[PDB]
Design a binder for this molecule. Structure first.
Ligand SMILES: Nc1ncnc2c1ncn2[C@@H]1O[C@H](COP(=O)(O)OP(=O)(O)OP(=O)(O)O)[C@@H](O)[C@H]1O
Length: 240
């Protein structure tokens, strides 16, 4: 099935350890849009993405991918279905060079031209990466590694690209380039679910946003409108 809503979370509840991390949230990520989930550290952003990816259990509610209930399915299955996740930590394989890291992303495509066009498309998106194609990973700057992690996910031609704090700890200029690349990716049609602590940057590129506070959504709406909301501005953008 193919839906206009690529991902829908319904009354999701997540419990682990001693804490009730997510307390019944609802979210929708429309096809071709960039949706962002923002909130302070510890709001439950990573947990939300983990639940969706099946890395943590959903005690209540459901996660629907293109109309199909994938609630609590095996993480490896959910990945094969088309949901790509670029977790926090710019996880990359340092022992493999930039080229190998990108290519391992298209391990299940069988494509011939597509893989070709996609590899070159990623080159225009990340000039600095092509500048160090034969170079190993772990020898690039965190900024470059972050860009490499994103490139790898792209080579799998994701039906849904999820990213957890893509700009965390980066220099202003890199933060700016991260968000610009996210926009370029979306302009090609890729649906994105972006989790960020940098609310300003996230809301500026997103179509829709959700504000998560202590496991619950307190506000949601068109991104441009959230930027003009007094509560968002004072609480997340520093305008008090
Ligand atoms: N030892 C603990 N004591 C209290 N709360 C804890 C503990 N360990 C984990 N948590 C819970 O973890 C949740 C925060 O982690 P989560 O991964 O959801 O954060 P996040 O806001 O997405 O940040 P990041 O994206 O950086 O991981 C909170 O609900 C917090 O209460």
């Amino acid at each position: 099935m193919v839906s206009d809503i690529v991902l829908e979370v319904q009354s999701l509840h997540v419990y682990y350890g001693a804490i009730h991390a997510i307390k019944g949230i609802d979210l929708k990520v429309p096809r071709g849009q960039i949706v962002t989930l923002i909130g302070a550290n510890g709001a439950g952003k990573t947990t939300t993405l983990s639940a969706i990816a099946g890395l943590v259990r959903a005690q209540k509610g459901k996660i629907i991918f293109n109309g199909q209930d994938i609630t609590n399915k095996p993480a490896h299955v959910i990945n094969r279905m088309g949901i790509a996740l670029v977790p926090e930590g710019r996880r990359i394989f340092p022992e493999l060079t930039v080229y190998e890291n990108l290519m391992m992303g298209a391990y299940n495509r069988k494509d011939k031209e597509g893989i070709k066009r996609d590899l070159e498309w990623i080159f225009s998106l990340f000039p600095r990466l092509k500048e160090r194609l034969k170079q190993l990973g772990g020898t690039l700057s965190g900024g470059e590694q972050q860009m490499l992690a994103i490139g790898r996910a792209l080579m799998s031609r994701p039906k849904l690209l999820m990213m957890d704090e893509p700009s965390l700890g980066l220099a202003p200029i890199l933060v700016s380039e991260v968000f610009e690349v996210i926009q370029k990716i979306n302009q090609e049609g890729t649906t994105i679910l972006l989790v960020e602590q940098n609310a300003l940057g996230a809301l500026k590129v997103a179509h829709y946003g959700y504000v998560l506070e202590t496991g619950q959504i307190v506000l949601e709406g068109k991104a441009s409108e959230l930027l003009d909301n007094e509560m968002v501005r004072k609480a997340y953008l520093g305008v008090a």
